[PDB]
Amino acid sequence: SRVTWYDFLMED
Amino acid sequence: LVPRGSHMDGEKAAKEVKLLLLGAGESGKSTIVKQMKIIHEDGYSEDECKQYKVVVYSNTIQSIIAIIRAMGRLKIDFGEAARADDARQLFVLAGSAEEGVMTSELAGVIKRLWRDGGVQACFSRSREYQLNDSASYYLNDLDRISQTNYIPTQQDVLRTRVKTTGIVETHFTFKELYFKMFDVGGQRSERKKWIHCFEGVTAIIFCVALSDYDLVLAEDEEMNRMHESMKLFDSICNNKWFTDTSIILFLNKKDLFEEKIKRSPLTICYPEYTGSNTYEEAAAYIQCQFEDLNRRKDTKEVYTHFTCATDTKNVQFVFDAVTDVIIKNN
Ligand SMILES: Nc1nc2c(ncn2[C@@H]2O[C@H](COP(=O)(O)OP(=O)(O)O)[C@@H](O)[C@H]2O)c(=O)[nH]1
């Protein structure tokens, strides 16, 4: 779902 | 009849610079946006400043209330019992200035509270409740800001703290470059929006509040603020999106850090630190702590600057250097 930019970057 | 020339009229298209301001809350991002407005833009008109009157009053009241509540949490008594009464009235009249009008009664309450010795004892321990760094600015200028004819000065506007909901952007022209500067907070958003925000970014400025080194931890926080910021900066440096990007590090709030390092040991933040508790060595240690997170130092460089984001002259100088760097790498 919605996510902070840090968690977005670390998803990879 | 003279045929008209091209619309451009011999002018080349300006090169566009996508710049992202990143960092934890209270690191100085919005202050840098406002500094850009002051330096490379119109500034702030009186119609713009009058709008910030309510915000000035709200920040002042919220700050004094935070100190008062901290007193109760920290078992700090008032220097004079009478202040208790004042405290109560402060909570009754906390919403009185929503109309941009600070009544004489409320101003008197805030003045008598800010004067008290116990309130100052709590202000000095501000690190235990993470008091915002604009509290003293407004409270020490209470006489000036209380007047009915008061209109916020430019420095008053720099110091305001506003909640960010949407896309905070500013645009300007500097050295024939069109800067699109986006302030990026910690809000949760859709992944496609992050993809769009991190695409084609020319430069990143990561702001770090040095003076946050000695702040207590809030409940359920896994680490202190400085280490949260180190985590963010690690993810920034060593990501694929930004291999091309110029990463700039603003070690901000150096004025507050210089006064703090005397009284508060850096060991509070870095228990392993064995150096001296002086401005120079502690600042170097923090700088290296953030820099060594770069796991590709040969291929990629980190441009570090120590800043006082509320000082327009320092910001102007630093941003001039930043723009020189951006041009060099383009
Ligand atoms: N003394 C001092 N205060 C600062 C400095 N930078 C920011 N502040 C204040 O710290 C508060 C938070 O700064 P802000 O720019 O809003 O952080 P943001 O959440 O990342 O936007 C504000 O009251 C700023 O005025 C600085 O360099 N020195």
Side-chain angles (χ1 to χ4, degrees), chain B residues 6-7 22 30 46 52 68 86 91 101 114 128 137 149 185 193 200 211 249-250 252 268 271 276 299 303 316-317 329:
Chain B
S6 175
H7 189 6
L22 278 58
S30 67
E46 252 191 24
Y52 284 93
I68 294 304
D86 293 337
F91 292 111
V101 198
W114 190 229
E128 302 179 40
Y137 174 79
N149 63 62
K193 293 208 178 309
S211 52
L249 185 70
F250 279 6
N252 194 34
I268 296 166
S276 62
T299 59
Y303 310 89
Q316 184 169 34
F317 172 90
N329 304 0

Side-chain angles (χ1 to χ4, degrees), chain A residues 1-3 5-6 11-12, chain B residues 185 189-191 194 231 240:
Chain A
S1 67
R2 273 150 179 245
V3 65
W5 64 255
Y6 173 82
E11 269 181 354
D12 190 356
Chain B
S189 292
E190 302 79 356
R191 292 181 178 78
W194 289 132
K231 194 164 98 289
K240 323 190 233 187

